[PDB]
Amino acid sequence: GKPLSCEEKEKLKEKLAFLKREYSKTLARLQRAQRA
Amino acid sequence: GKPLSCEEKEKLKEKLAFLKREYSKTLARLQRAQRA
Secondary structure: OOOOOHHHHHHHHHHHHHHHHHHHHHHHHHHHHHHO | OOOOOHHHHHHHHHHHHHHHHHHHHHHHHHHHHHHO
């Protein structure tokens, strides 16, 4: 981890990722709800 | 016409947007870690 400590670089990287996962979830409901 | 109440789909729709705005903020930070 040349840049920010690996513990940080990974924390930020993995974090941002898990974020994209939560975003989709929000849509999931909106998806079905709309189809309802 | 529309599933739940009108304000219901609005609150969620608007809320979801906020999430997207946050993401960008995150990416920015990282963009700096690589800036070097």
